[PDB]
Amino acid sequence: ISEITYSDGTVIASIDYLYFTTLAEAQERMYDYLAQRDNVSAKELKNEATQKFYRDLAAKEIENGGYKITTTIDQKIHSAMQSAVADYGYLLDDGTGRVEVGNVLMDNQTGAILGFVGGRNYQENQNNHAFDTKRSPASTTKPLLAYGIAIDQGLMGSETILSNYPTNFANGNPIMYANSKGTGMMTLGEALNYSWNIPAYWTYRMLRENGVDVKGYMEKMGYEIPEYGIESLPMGGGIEVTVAQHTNGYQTLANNGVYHQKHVISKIEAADGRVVYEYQDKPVQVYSKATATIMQGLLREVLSSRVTTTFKSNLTSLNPTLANADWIGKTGTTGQDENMWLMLSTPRLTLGGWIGHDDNHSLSQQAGYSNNSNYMAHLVNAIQQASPSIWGNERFALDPSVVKSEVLKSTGQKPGKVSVEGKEVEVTGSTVTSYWANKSGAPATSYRFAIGGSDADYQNAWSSIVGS
């Protein structure tokens, strides 16, 4: 009798989302193992008939064998997450029909998956929203693919200024944020807290212009994106992900820039104890520790600001002590409200969350801001009541390698002479600490001080500043 087990070895089942997800993954491990065992090359595995046979053999091998498949799943925590979706699932329903949901709770030090929600109720709808459904991750792409990489590359600090003035995509359409064609200059923090789009667009433009290897970063974390030239990439255009994959992206940021590959299987043993597969840790430093910890600091304010999510309010009411753990995170909303995301970390754990409809019809405007935030607050609470120390009380903290520059609030760059329409001008004014992940820190102030912006934009902004 083969058995799928929780991480402590309690038996899940002899050989619902949990069963079928872990069994499908075990079948894939068994496939690789049998193929190598029989000396079938990946040249021969190119053959559909050979491949099919080996898939069948893998499945029957588990059925008939006496294998012990040890998963990473924590019984108590995964059972708490099931009861939480059962009990509080209905908080998602927002007047647009029944809302579907996926969640993945991941250990930031190992990438092990401790439990997950695959959906509202397997018995009514079997689609697995944690591992199978691929969806645009919307604005939760920004910290990873735009600002994170900019910061990593010495192209941006914590208090850098970005343009949020009006501007068009290549196709001539305006870049929108709900009904706003935009505003003016803003700090990176404000851009993150509001999730404005134009500042993200300019950041990614800057990366392209500099020929930064964005793919090198994203592929290290296991993302597959077919076109890196897409302008709205940081807003979720041209990227689709499962919740488990995307959680692994936030795991990397939470773990001080060090990726660990997600997994639900830690080991498969034959009846006699032969280890036929075992997870092998392959840690990767995807962002510098300076970058990661700078980003942790920005993402803490995302949640504490409560601009795009009610989550910290919902949590503080449910569980004030837990709300005082060091929560960081980012929300996402797709352009027609088709996908809402909330990704959450403490230094120990990352919990990813998606809601949406299976046929891609729209959620209500506030599904992500309010409903998912409340559901995920109840989820988080449930996890903690199951395993009181699991989230931890550690804080995220800036790595010793972070560089601190004193920069003008108004420019995000150092006080200096700047040439402004003819005149060289002493740019002076009140300053602020800005965090950087390069060697030298922030540049001296320049005329084009901000990330992006047209000539008109700068004339408007300099006029403004020049009122000293």
Q: How far is CA 104 from CA 10, 341, 368, in A?
A: 21, 12, 17
Instruction: Give yes or no for residue 190 binding ligand E07 (CB under 6 A).
Output: no
In the set 48, 178, 422, 430, which binds ligand E07 (CB under 6 A)? 178
Told to check if 65 binds a copy of itself by CB under 8 A, we report no
Token pair of 436, please? 């950087």
> According to the annotation, is 224 in a ligand binding site?
yes
When the beta carbons of 307 and 466 are compared against Na ion, the nearer one is 307
Q: Is 242 in the site for Cl ion (CB under 5 A)?
A: yes
Q: How far is the CB of 223 from ligand E07 (least distance, A)?
A: 17
Q: Is 336 in the site for a copy of itself (CB under 8 A)?
A: yes
- Minimum CB separation of residue 31 from a copy of itself in Å reads 24
User: Pick from 257, 332, 353, 441: which binds ligand E07 (CB under 6 A)?
Assistant: 332
Least Cβ distance, residue 164 to Na ion (angstroms): 15
CA separation, residue 12 to residues 62, 264, 346, 353, 406 (Å):
15, 13, 28, 24, 56
104-163 binders of Na ion (CB under 5 A)? 139
Distance CA 138, CA 241 (A): 10
Residue with tokens 């499962």: 242
Q: 312 is in the binding site of which of Cl ion, Na ion, a copy of itself, none (Cβ under 5 to 8 A by kind)?
A: Cl ion
Nearer to Na ion, 247 or 308 (CB): 308
Residue 235 binds a copy of itself, judged by CB under 8 A: yes
Q: Which residues of 321-342 are buried (b: 16+ CB within 10 A; e: fewer)?
A: ebbebbbbbbbbbbbebbbbbb
Work out which of 297, 335, 415, 443 binds a copy of itself, going by CB under 8 A: 335
Cβ closer to a copy of itself: 2 or 197? 197
Q: Return the HEC string of 96-117.
A: CCCCEEEEEEEECCCCEEEEEE
Name which of residues 200 to 219 contact a copy of itself (CB under 8 A). Answer: 208-209
What separation in angstroms does the CA of 209 have from each of 149, 152, 181, 213? 13, 16, 24, 11
Judged by CB under 6 A, the residue of 75, 167, 187, 333 near ligand E07 is: 333
Q: Return the residues preceding each gap in the chain, C–N over 2.5 A, or none.
A: 15
308 binds Na ion (CB under 5 A): yes
CA distance 188 to 173: 24
Number of H helices, E strands in the chain: 14, 18
* Residue number with CB closer to Na ion (304 or 419): 304
d(CA 216, CA 213): 5
Contact residue for a copy of itself among 184, 238, 297, 416 (CB under 8 A): 238
Does 243 sit near Cl ion (CB under 5 A)? no
Confirm whether residue 222 is marked as ligand binding: yes
Radius of gyration of the chain (CA): 24
How far, in Å, are 185, 332, 394, 399 from residue 341 at the CA level? 27, 5, 25, 28
Residues near a copy of itself (CB under 8 A): 136, 169-172, 208-209, 226-233, 235, 237-238, 334-336, 338
- Binding-site annotation, residues for Mg(2+): 222, 224
- Binding-site annotation, residues: 222, 224
